[PDB]
Enzyme design. Structure first.
Site, PDB file in Angstrom:
ATOM      1  CE  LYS A  29      -4.445   0.800   0.121  1.00  0.00           C
ATOM      2  NZ  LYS A  29      -5.415   0.033  -0.716  1.00  0.00           N
TER       3      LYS A  29
ATOM      4  CG  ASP B 217      -7.149   3.294  -2.263  1.00  0.00           C
ATOM      5  OD1 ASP B 217      -7.597   4.162  -1.469  1.00  0.00           O
ATOM      6  OD2 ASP B 217      -7.244   2.062  -2.057  1.00  0.00           O
TER       7      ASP B 217
END
Lengths: 456, 456, 456, 456
Positions: C135, C175
């Site tokens: 991430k 995202d």
């Protein structure tokens, strides 16, 4: 929107003129390139009207992303230290790694390469496969060189190029002067330097990463393209009187596929004179022509000792014969006006280009104003470039598809290439113009992606 | 014992003609390059006579080892997506890593770069330091661009170039359009990409890897060169009258060193008119001229609004005044056949070129036939290129030599550059010709090393 | 067989307590992370009982394999030199290259990223595809920035990250704050730096390496998951009264697939109020809602102006309406205690989570003690992550599968994800608990592989 | 503190026997290597007594860190595809990058190379400079090959080796079969591949990174070593009558330095017979012998023509002459027991080995028991290896030291090499034994560093 210059009022025509002027001034002495440019520029007027951005984008795309030139030294067999100039123009990598062949010819120079490479961008684009555009080569003249010298040269040439090409960067291929024999040497050397077996080159022999259908590729493609134009007219190839010109690699397999479908292929040209054959050729007869032409390296007349009902006309074209479809598969401008009148007269309904731009600029005018379907070579013979993309896929998968499988893929690729020309030309010209469709479609995929990626 | 092509019976002159022909045909449209070539070719006839090999070797060396060209995109302040063409010609790396500046000018193109780069090979060669030859730049025009835009451009430019340069590969530097400010941006970007602090560029600020004497470098060098010609005549600079031209960077420090020695520097030119000063300038006065000229950025005529004792003529260089040593620092063929006489007449014993080729081709003839020592700019002002080689050394040693130390090194380098011209010209022409000496010496070091390394 | 600590006779509960204590002390100020940890820790008690090793393994896996943080500088449009903090947490690469999106939000920091990345490990794990967990992101706030600034930022951000990501190392994705537009810029810059076209990012546009079904991916997946839970009860989706909440990307395609199957989708929520539609929505009506929602961009009450029968309920949750299946798709804690009761009252036999953890911790208790099937979001919406894995595959194969093909693959992946939750929960709890099944299964694949690979 | 090989209570002799047994069994068929090993093993007994650790350390060090062997293909001039075996043994890199020459000989094989490389480790060690040990070569036979073929071979050979060598990894050099001509080709090719000018090879020509004193290096060193042995006896070389054996490169410069000091060099051997010259040779006479020997490429007997006084013998060792110092610079087993008894009978004082191990194993016994100083070739002629280390330094500094400077450095290196043998042998044997001193000192520096670095 974005800002790539050209925000003025200027009639779309004045902007197109401003651009042309700017591109010419920066490339004053590259005739071959400037010509292939002014060419792509023409058919792109409709899209310019839809959005000015594309004019700037085109100026950008016309500038090679990068071009590497290098001195290639080698020792001939008499022990002499020779030298040649090598090139690799990595024109555009927006849609994928740079793809493009290598040409070894005494006429080779930057201008020539840019010309070829520039056109490759869009041809590849249509393919549907992820391939950028590139081109390379040397002014090295294979003619007269010994087997050993060709090897020495390839090795040297690759020693320079090797650091700039790669499976995910630039994948070169064969072209004039660079055939299978050459690709073997190039590959061998590359492997030795990089220390790895990977798809850096397409057109590799079948024993080591090559693909099936590589030979037939282009020819089969041309037929598949035409077969698609026909199916969109509730008709097919079955029983169509076809005219073919040339007896090269493309011409041969074109005929092979044609025969296999509906047949009635009436002719096959040669560097001097053509052959007739009422009732069409047959599987068997083609094998002879293939033999005579490949192995026996004999003139096309030769066939005459093989056929009862043959007929060889010399120093003439097959264009005054009545036909349904016609395949110009020899060389540029083999179709002038007189040939249009001939076609428009025998009521010929379609012409599928096999060789690169076999139609003369003014010949297309009469043909279009007479409702005769003209298939762009840029799209019709992209079959070859497409299969090489599949070679790349097979190499990545570490498998080899069957002659069967590879063919099917080629058929869908051809079908798609057709649909894009059809739909694009429809959307932008309101009518179905395959020639403009090919250019617009090819350019747009690149232009848009270029923009989406930040204009790099 | 090596075979590079010209083994025939042909007159050394016919071979030289054959070569010229071959080089021209391959570079038809590169005037600037072809001219700088036909130039080096001239003075190299004596060596060709000693051995044919060199003719072939020259053909090889004239072909850039490699040349990279690339599209440099950037966004100006109005948010426009601009584009420029960048170049890096890695001409020769036989004596060391490619060394050579970067030029940002609207006139920049491959031909121009090859020209500059080709000459750099030999200039560097004389240096004694291990430096190959290279050159790069863009057609980007700094003029009119904002500070911010210059930064954006440098970053983009380096993003492309960064992968092809390195401490042991190619070490670029400043030139027209690329000054200190620029080298800072270029370096910063390079560091960020490569992730390492290393000497990729010379001309870096002193705070981060720069060298002492970088500014004075060239000027000091020219004086040191002359000081060496004199010492080989049991004489020195003490009490000699000097006709220095120009008031640029070179001119200034040239004067500063001259004064510091024996002095009696009488003049300093300008883009329009010059200044006189009987009894010579003085340390103090030079500071004024430096001030008036560097910071204030105001026409040199302003020196007239300073000390009274100095006049100021108009539209010409001080080629008339009775001087014994002439230093021309301006631009191309700054001096011609007309001035040439004013010199023969007044009688300038020696002339040390400061700017690049400030003497006209025909002017050299009369000067030589009148026994007036002429120092080649190729050698006399190599002081600058030499100090940048020392910057590289200091960078590798991770230390910075004192203003003192660096100077001494430069003095020995200059002394060596002189000895080579002197001895070489003597050995090959039987007489002491500095101009031919510089060319022959410079070329030979490269040519031989080339052969010793396998002809790669 | 391998010792990773916790060997004492201590109760499984005391070891779990010892671990929690140790993990907390090392990450004192990372609330978001510590919470997502204490969460995965809960459902993993059954496996801990089977073998202590896993407690140690978990302590190890909870420690990011590596985390890179870096300063991302950029120049806004006013010419200001701004700065932001960037992150990339390569949490685990046991099952494959690090996979995980990039988030650009003012709230972003190491704690937040670890939290998201830590959960990604297991979510990916279930996928069946070879994907590690990662991430990244920045505290950069897209909101308010100009188009141009977003570009400048992406480029800078990628210039730092580019050296640590790669096709076989770390493949980032979109995202919050990083959408298609952004991935285009990121990709563009990456390509320019690394000099190669390769799958470093998923969610690329279809013109350049993107995949089909990317948009519909997650929604379709949720339905496929539910369709599998049903088929294991000799029933299907045909004619089931359903409750959906939300009108986002997921919600829309969820409905589209539902309709296409058995239909009877009764509702669609909004940030304030929901919509009813007895007899269910229809293909046509969904297109309106899609239009109204993605183009017009207005509240949902708007649908009323498109349907007579459609009733709207200002500020509420749909839950009370009787249904067979409820697909929550809004945000965390969307289903409260009192709500959950109505589902049991209404006969609702199942709830498939669409958004991430739309059920409140205490709400799950009543639902489970009332025999109402609850599908874990971790598994039900993994459809998105799964398709991105297929994008990677297609990129490697250098081909693009048809909308058709890609869908089928997603269906099998969903089927597998279901089977693992089912079988795993059965084997470890003796009953069929999908929620625990998802956690255990996801963790075990990673934990075991970790051990088999040497505990690195 | 750290537990390596042995600590079995065994007798130091039994451990040495256990080790020998273990090393032999693993290298059964490498005679040359096993012999050079059992040799170093002998003189290392004193240190084994001080600490067992060293026995294990030696077993480790005796195992090449890494050895690369590869097929080197090439095309001779008749167009034949030939093949040869290449090797590169990177024996030890504890003290620095692997250093060691390349040998091209029909007898070359792994065993031979390990032998040479193994010895190189310690020889380099004594140098004081940071150099590891290595060795390489091929069974390629230069003899009979054409100039062109040698080039082709070098290029191929380097193409394989290039990826494993580097300025900070492995720096090869010349040896039998690999001279200056060869190092030029090797370097040229390396530069082309790696694309960078750096010190990968030592023994480069002076024009491109070579060093001064490279030729004289070894000879000068031997004298400097002896001059140091003498100064530690309040005496110098001035007026000492001595005999040299050989007229090779070493022998010549040895004499040159000797003459230059105190002189009285009486002889110079040849492959058959030697020369006498009472009152010693003179600067001038040596130039004749140098001329006669290098260019003319004749036998030493042809000197008799350039000097009346000089007599001449045939196939007779020059050892039965009374003197002070002797210097065997020819080849192995130059001094037998027989030739040894002559030395004692001529009251000979000291013997400085020039060639490698010119003394027979049993000859050393009588000489030592007669108080005749014997200088180990391992140390006395390390002058060559030392200068190559300086070449590396100069290459890194990007400068070339003067013939003057480089000499001085060599003198200090020789002085140090002496001091270490002296002090080490004293500390470990209580007496001053140069031969054992060389071995112990050389081994200890490596062995300790090995331990300090973790035993890798």
């Amino acid at each position: 929107l974005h800002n790539y210059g050209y925000t003025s009022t200027k009639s779309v025509d004045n902007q197109i003129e401003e651009l042309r002027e700017k591109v010419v001034s920066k490339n004053k002495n590259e005739p071959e390139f400037l010509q292939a440019f002014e060419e792509v520029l023409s058919c792109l007027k409709p899209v310019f009207k839809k959005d000015n951005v594309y004019i700037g984008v085109l100026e950008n795309i016309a500038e090679p992303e990068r071009v590497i030139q290098f001195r290639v030294p080698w020792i001939n067999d008499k022990g002499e230290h020779k030298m040649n100039r090598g090139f690799r123009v990595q024109y555009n990598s927006v849609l994928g790694p740079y793809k493009g062949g290598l040409r070894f010819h005494p006429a080779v120079n930057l201008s020539v390469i840019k010309f070829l490479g520039f056109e490759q961008i869009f041809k590849n684009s249509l393919t549907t496969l992820p391939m950028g555009g590139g081109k390379g080569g040397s002014d090295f003249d294979p003619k007269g060189k010994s087997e050993n010298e060709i090897l020495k040269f390839c090795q040297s040439f690759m020693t320079n190029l090797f650091r700039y090409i790669g499976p995910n960067t630039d994948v070169p291929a064969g072209d004039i002067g660079v055939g299978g024999r050459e690709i073997g040497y190039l590959f061998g050397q590359y492997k030795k330097l990089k220390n790895s077996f990977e798809g850096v080159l397409t057109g590799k022999n079948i024993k080591w990463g090559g693909s099936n259908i590589r030979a037939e590729a282009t020819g089969y493609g041309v037929v598949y393209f035409a077969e698609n134009v026909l199916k969109d007219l509730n008709d097919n190839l079955e029983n169509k009187k076809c005219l073919v010109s040339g007896s090269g690699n493309v011409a041969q397999y074109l005929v092979e596929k044609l025969i296999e479908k509906g047949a009635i292929v009436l002719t096959m040209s040669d560097s001097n004179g053509y052959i007739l054959e009422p009732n069409g050729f047959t599987k068997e007869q083609l094998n002879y022509i293939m033999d005579i032409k490949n192995n026996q390296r004999l003139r096309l007349k030769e066939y005459l000792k093989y056929s009862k009902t043959a007929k060889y006309f010399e120093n003439q074209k097959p264009w005054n014969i009545p036909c349904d479809i016609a395949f110009p598969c020899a060389t540029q401008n083999e179709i002038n006006e007189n040939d249009a009148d001939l076609f428009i007269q025998n009521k010929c309904k379609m012409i599928v280009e096999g060789a690169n731009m076999p139609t003369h600029i003014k010949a297309l005018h009469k043909l279009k104003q007479n409702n005769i379907i003209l298939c762009p070579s840029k799209a019709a013979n992209a079959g070859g470039v497409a299969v090489s993309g599949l070679e790349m896929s097979q190499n990545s998968m570490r498998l080899q598809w069957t002659h069967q499988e590879t063919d099917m893929k080629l058929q869908n690729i051809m079908k798609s290439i057709y649909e894009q020309c059809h739909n694009t030309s429809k959307i932008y010209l309101n009518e179905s113009d395959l020639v403009a469709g090919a250019n617009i479609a090819g350019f747009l995929k690149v232009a848009d992606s270029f923009l989406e990626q930040g204009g790099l």
